[model samples]
Target: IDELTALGGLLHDIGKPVQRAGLDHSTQGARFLRDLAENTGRAEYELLSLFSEFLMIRRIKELSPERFGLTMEDVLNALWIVYEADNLASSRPLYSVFNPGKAYPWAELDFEKELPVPGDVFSIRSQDYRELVKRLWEELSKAKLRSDRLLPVLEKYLTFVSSVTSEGNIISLYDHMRMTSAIALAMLRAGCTAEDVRSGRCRKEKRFLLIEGDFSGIQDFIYRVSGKGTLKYLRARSAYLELIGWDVVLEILSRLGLTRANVVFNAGGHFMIIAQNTPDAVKELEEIRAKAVEWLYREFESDLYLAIEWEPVSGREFGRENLFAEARKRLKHKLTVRKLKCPTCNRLVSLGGNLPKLLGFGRTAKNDAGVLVEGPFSGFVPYLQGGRPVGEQILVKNTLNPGEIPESAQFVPYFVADYFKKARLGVLRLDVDNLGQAFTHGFNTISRTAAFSRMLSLFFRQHINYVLARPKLRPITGDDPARPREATIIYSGGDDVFVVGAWDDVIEFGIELRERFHEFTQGKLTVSAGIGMFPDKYPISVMAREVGDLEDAAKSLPGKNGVALFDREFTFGWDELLSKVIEEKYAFIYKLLELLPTDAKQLKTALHLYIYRTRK
Candidate 1:
């Protein structure tokens, strides 16, 4: 019952950005939905329209709800809930009125030409708009309605397009739509109706649950020592924590019958979900927290901790009180106190015991002690086919070669560090700037705010892969005989990224990613970063903390869009560092070296001294 209702809130806005004119979005939406539901002449259409009844069930307002075993009032109340949800979701200070022609796709960063348009993002690239509607129909037309399947569909298409083009935009159509559905279900479950909202009732009543799941000791878990398995261990551990968090998220959604749309954000060892405030939901959230925490303890012992907590919120508090901050605060408080019981120490089951048994070959996970993140291994074709993520095995992304993407962990010095001409390891850390402020002020409504968070997730989780795959990176590694000119995305997806590669290549990646981020946000957003070089054999745990400190220095720059390199005490604005320092200064130095030739061997020693002075 709630599925159809929530989906109604979700799909109700799709027509807002479609290319056609001469029809209200309501009429266009109802017509498209009606066709998708009633016109099932094709076989895939039958499968795609599996939720046909529910697709059209929303339109059952006048047709009588009993056809679906629902009372007329129940169905009407559901519709009322959707109406209020959309109204509430869209109840921002500005953009209350949408300018249809102003619908847009974000201005892309590549060489692709953008049509001169009126919006901060392209106002309405006919190509983008038309293709958008076309693809939306195709994906929706063939998709079987399940939360897992449809959520990605909505995310892919709706993430970039502005929900409204009035005065201020950036609140994406995807965020607005997802929030509407989330709010609708919360209202439905809480017995809220349009009249109650319209009459100013239930505003102060707590009707939502803000759940926070934070993984404790993330650094310690991710950077633990593992000898030759360093590269893969870091990669695998980060992925494990991410998947584990998703597992807990899935548990909550399943117990509550909620969908991915309910997830506020899930990335970087933490997640926030918006659930209905109910006794059962509260119970299930706590129960799942215990279950997940206990499971982690059993699996990794004190090596990891999952602190799951929630705070009750009202519709009014969602936007006004900034519930995410408060929920996170409570979660942090809980974690802080719980750690007071730390028996002076906790240790992990040491690895490297089998260093002799494994030589160049990496560990191949032989079991599936639960490996999933939102979607099923419908694609894992491997976790279920070959190496699993558990039981004496591990997995890592082979950024250097796409053919071996999900390969087992291998010796880092051999496959990674040895490939570098310099043979020095480089670690680059990037964090999006003003992300918290954007959460609070840029997108004020709960739905609107979460949508913004999802946009960051989409970019970091999905787009960063594409960002790293850019051809520009190939040039940096081109000189190396074996290195593929790529940096391993050790763990990215959230506002921040941690990447490792040969020194030169990692720097090149930092430059490219910083520029790419500018394009992704159309200059409205920025990220500060740090790039540090170290010995190939340095402990990753130490490297991570040191690099993080450098990132802190970069972030301390006045405007904050800066990067610190090596052991620099101060940061240079990213543009200045790239243009003046590298492009111009490096060119000047190259010419100077040509003019005053010196002994190559001796100069190489002096260069080492130059680098060593800064290295610890």
Candidate 2:
């Protein structure tokens, strides 16, 4: 029932692209769904089509629920469920239809006073209305229609299509549908009534809770360790934290009876979701946090910690206050409070010295059916049969078989370290700068913001995998070894990336990533990076912070769009660094050394000393 209701919420506005004034978007959406059902010959789609029709909550629309041929209290209740949920998803004027009353020349999202939208829209070169609908029908008909798996299909087709062309034209149809469906499930579980959802009353009552979970000391945990199998251990540890975050996210969703649509955004070691603000759900969130923190202690001890906090949010507060920002603030502050209390003898109860009873290593852990899992095994737990961990924690590799050279997961840092032509390694950090402002100023509407987030998410989530798996990025070959881009993605999502691997490969990967990202955003955006060079035995903790400082230096550059290297003593624009320094200058020096009579090392040292003595 919940999945059915959520499907209605998601598809209610599917007809926005083909809309006109005389025929409201809701009726058109329902009619399309009906036609779609008839074509598929599936009775299950009947309820889905029915759910798309009710465009208002309090007073029914002119095209009443009765038009669906089912006016029973049960059918009407489902209609009201989606209606109220849609209003909460996107506030509307009394007549309550999200109408595209008129047309304006559509534009891409960017910094241009015109490209002001934030999301990445997969635009069809031709904007023919008939073409758009024709493509949409073909795509949706093939989609798995279940609400959970349906969003990705909608996102691919509708991200570029405007939600309300006449009004603001800032949001995407996909974003609006996602929010509506998410709110519908939460609303139904929270027992919110149609009266409670009406505009005037919805503003006064707190109906939803913005839930945020953040992992602290990610750097310290990933880099603080040392010695044999170091790279493998670090990779495993990073994967572990990601899995824990995924487990907690699913645990919360399961308890609330919410769908993945409720997960507003997830990246790195953190996630935020929306659930009905009930004492029941709130208490479950706290328990999830407690066990999560305990699980961290059981494995990494205090090296890793997770802090979670939930804030009751009214429907009116969605856009007024930055929900994402506010949720982060509460969690960080709560993390600080927890840390401060953990050290005090009077309040140490929360940080248990004794561990909880174990959920075995992996044998009994294999069993399912509400199985209480702990640690990395939780990641492998069957979440409704599809075992993939939630969020964007995917890895890239060639074929099903292993690559030519050993990877971080299979080898020790020692071998890869010695394998390096120079016996060096690097940790690189890259970030998309000034994105918050890009969204705040340009993507002011919810649709635009959500779309913008999805765009950035996919770049790191999907495209990064492509770049990493490229043949050029694969392991080294023979004597020439030829600058193979052997790197590991420690974590890369949510507008930033952290990578660790061979010195040359890490640097090459960073440069390739920025170049691809520049191409990806079509030069409308830029990124900053910092790379720290070190030997295999260097403390990972120190390497992490040193790279962070370099990233900070990169950001401080006048226009940004630069990389800081060799400890920030050298910083240059990507074009200058890749071309002038690496290509022309160093290549020329090496070329000159190839035939020169004198010792090349001594000659290069003299050249460097002369340059150092000369004034800038």
Candidate 3:
């Protein structure tokens, strides 16, 4: 009985894939099951047909439970069971909570939860959808999906959603089906008695625990520690920030006895953990925060601090509100009051203590007393491991992928040049454009929405490693292949990326990045990037801020998907520039440099004069 019922539940929406013309999918499902029964034998057909009946809520009042081989009580209980379970699964509200009270403009025109009208009424293409349906059916017949399955589905759907809706918001059908199934399975595990469900006696106490952590005064800290704008200094600053962020997350998770999977969502400097609200859990969480404060002080002399918040989510409020927003509201007061004073300067900074003697910056050396001394910003000694801290240990290896940066030069600067050398250093900031609207309106359900996010993260992580090795960066590449890479990845995660390298190499990397991004998202998505170049002696903080401004300028253009290079905006596609414009421009610049006098001072004077004359 249980097997048949479970099978019925799984097949309830089978007709949706074959739906056309009218939205009466339940009737079509019943017809499909009748044919199956005729071929598979009477019993199989009977069970499948009964599953079809549960999908049509409107028609439930018309059928007699006895006629369908169910008792009166079984009839109501079965329908309600699937009905309640499906509702819970289809509307988990995870995405919705990400943006509250936002317009679902296409929601009113939706034909079914899975088939909402496209936002742009006219962008609908019959050929694209026809191909989509053909591919979907072909996959279904094989009883499994090919790897490229989700991309095409998202591509066609988003094309229409972006055109019709304000921000291309969509609720996906596949997501609803998966969520519904998962909910049903979990409920069954928790003991799904038919009598208890029908009488509303199955309710259990539940609570949501939202955990948020952030590094305070990140910009000031990075600039203060690595003020010089050398590639090595910038990399070190980035490593410090990234390591501190990671350490706090791991620490909290370990203390709570939770795994990464327990985190429902994490991105953009925040993450959340959901568990049953109990007295023990609440107490443990508090203890973790208090311990974190002390540990951070010991590690960096409290130079850096982790601000944390704990919010209580009641049983009735599982999916009702914006979970993060609510948690952040309660956490704001705590974040404002937290602080620690520097011992030497006696000035108030964020909460922290002085660095341990062994973990100071620069190379380790012997003091006047002949005792080994650590430089400030040198790697912190592992709190659990008894050993001298090394400069290489400052970088958190796990945060970076193995092949992304050459292992040997991982902690050192990838690009090095003397002051008078033609080569210079710079930073590239790259991020997906119009991503929020694409995500919020791109799909209808949780599963596909999640699949899309996963694919996006994977693409960025993979390509950041791939672009560094290309020939475009040959200008900065060393004759010896064994050296560290020419480009360094400061950070790459989610839809954003940051890298520092030689000026020309960074620009080339951005172009290659955009090209790969175009192919990965199938032209349905685009990215905007900005590159800022500076001399090795300039301030690191100022260079980073300039790159951020360049990125903003690129994003501000009429339709983003542009790049700002050397204080100028280029709106051409990556392929166009690579194939034609870039080569021509470089040839012209090199020719002009060659025409100058052979003397270095004369060449410099001519270039400075040209720049002054051109400015007017």
Better TM-score candidate (2, 3): 2
Tens digits of per-residue lDDT for model 3 on 1-616?
3333344444556555334312155676666655555644443444445555563443443444455466555544554555545654330111221232222221211123222212222332334434444543443332211111222232222222221122323333433333333333323433455665565533332333445555565545655533424444444444445444444554454445433323333443444444334466668767766776666667465556666666654322333224333344454445445444323112112112221111222221213221222222222322112332243222222121112222222121111111111146768888889885675454323334444554455455444465455333332222445333357665676567777776655766687678767755557788888777776766666766778777887789767877765454433445444444443322443356678412343334334323422332
lDDT of all predictions: 0.57, 0.57, 0.45
TM-score per candidate, in order?
0.72, 0.69, 0.47
Q: Which stretches of candidate 3 lie over 4 Å from their true place?
A: 1-206, 210-217, 223-237, 265-268, 278-422, 436-439, 443-450, 470-485, 568-616
Off by over 4 Å in 2: 17-24, 55-71, 91-145, 166-170, 230-233, 321-423, 434-447, 466-486, 500-502, 518-526, 535-545, 552-561, 575-616
Q: Model 2 reaches what TM-score against the true structure? A: 0.69
RMSD, candidate 2, Å: 11.1
Clashing pairs in 2: 110-115, 119-452
Residue 276 CA error for candidate 1 (Å)? 1.0
lDDT of 2 by residue, 182-209 (tens): 7777777777655555544544577778
Highest-scoring model, TM-score = 1
Q: How close is candidate 3 to the true structure, as a TM-score?
A: 0.47
- List, residue by residue over 250-274, the lDDT tens digit for candidate 1: 5577678776677767766677777
